[PDB]
């Protein structure tokens, strides 16, 4: 059953209506030639300045480079995490170089145009579903807060897998569901390419299959120069999708409702600010002393610590994003500061855990409360320091993955060592002690 359809087959349009009716396709006419123009140089503007980057992802246990170059434009302070990798937004000119400032702006226009299109589609989708058997839900599933711009030149990048279930040709992006979206939220894409049985291998497509199902014939939508398609509602969860490479270079602007409830700057700042509620905070120095050693406060402390380190600092310093935009340099330098003080708190606790006159029963309580996070912290320091210095990250330019923050045991500037194995095996020792 290696079968697919395209508009060349008449079966295709009914297989469309009653398998994938949550796929929408508005041809380039639904977009002014003035909007096409402004957007298509916003792509080049961004591509000239060299903003886009292949991503060093990690799927299952293996590190891979993404065939596609990618940049993320969106609400300032917002982030989109996929494949264990967090992208940070190059911000666009909403509430609050010369070229870049206007490029990010264009897409915000693009983004607002699409958002309108997505609402009527979704109003028309609830309407078909009233003639047979809330409109703020619908507005919220269309409030795109970010767009992931995608680029590929099929000629400068001729290392492509073939589509295995249906024979759709080579793939610029393999079968997948989109991660980290608001539930039932829509995804809208502007596709921008340059210039007999099966699908046409010179032209770009988006593929679609039912999950778990390589029998029902896939779909293969042709995408030409300013075409748009929309994934409505549960589509991205009921269906897998892919991209099928054409012959010419191609941009795509893919607009999402990223689920950044724990993936925004204002959120991770506030966790730090809560963590540091246990710090006697009169003056910023390294006489870190803590108000409480209540075991729930310490646990919460050490957990926020891990989150800023691994979810924010290590994720950021695995990337660069320092060409078009610099928005994150202050915030990042400020989370390093908060992170560093916390390494002090952890120090404070280790001292407390070992103080002469603390009845072991209370020291076993402090331990048991903090051991998990301090052991998780070690294991991720390894996974990072490995994934960082996999020799696949030396090949990348001087423009390649830092392993940061990293200090070395003969570094009086850091209170505890970077390798906690002795400290943690030493904690576990006490707890088992009779
Ligand atoms: C092969 C490997 C490198 C593991 C890989 C596989 C799939 C993806 C795609 C992906 C996964 C999770 N969340 C979002 C995506 C993603 O980038 N979706 N964007 C698109 O499908 C864009 C389609 C289009 O260009 O219109 C990215 C990377
Ligand atoms: Ni996708």
From Swiss-Prot:
What is the tissue specificity? Answer: Ubiquitously expressed, with relatively high expression in adrenal glands and brain; especially in hypothalamus and pituitary. Highly expressed in highly expressed in acute myeloid leukemias (AML) with t(11;11)(q23;23) with KMT2A/MLL1 rearrangements, t(15;17)(q21;q21)/PML-RARA, FLT3-ITD, and/or NPM1 mutations.
Where is Fe cation annotated to bind? 176, 178, 241
| Reactions catalysed according to its record | a 5'-end (N(7)-methyl 5'-triphosphoguanosine)-(N(6),2'-O-dimethyladenosine) in mRNA + 2-oxoglutarate + O2 = a 5'-end (N(7)-methyl 5'-triphosphoguanosine)-(2'-O-methyladenosine) in mRNA + formaldehyde + succinate + CO2; an N(6)-methyladenosine in mRNA + 2-oxoglutarate + O2 = an adenosine in mRNA + formaldehyde + succinate + CO2; N(6)-methyladenosine in U6 snRNA + 2-oxoglutarate + O2 = adenosine in U6 snRNA + formaldehyde + succinate + CO2; a 5'-end (N(7)-methyl 5'-triphosphoguanosine)-(N(6),2'-O-dimethyladenosine) in U6 snRNA + 2-oxoglutarate + O2 = a 5'-end (N(7)-methyl 5'-triphosphoguanosine)-(2'-O-methyladenosine) in U6 snRNA + formaldehyde + succinate + CO2
Which keywords fit this entry according to its UniProt record?
Acetylation, Cytoplasm, Dioxygenase, Disease variant, Iron, Metal-binding, Nucleus, Obesity, Oxidoreductase, Phosphoprotein, Transferase
According to the record, the residues making up region (Fe2OG dioxygenase domain) are 6-261
**What are the N6-acetyllysine sites (modified residues) in this protein?**
161
Spell out the protein name for this chain. Answer: Alpha-ketoglutarate-dependent dioxygenase FTO
According to the entry, what is the taxonomic lineage of the organism?
A: Eukaryota, Metazoa, Chordata, Craniata, Vertebrata
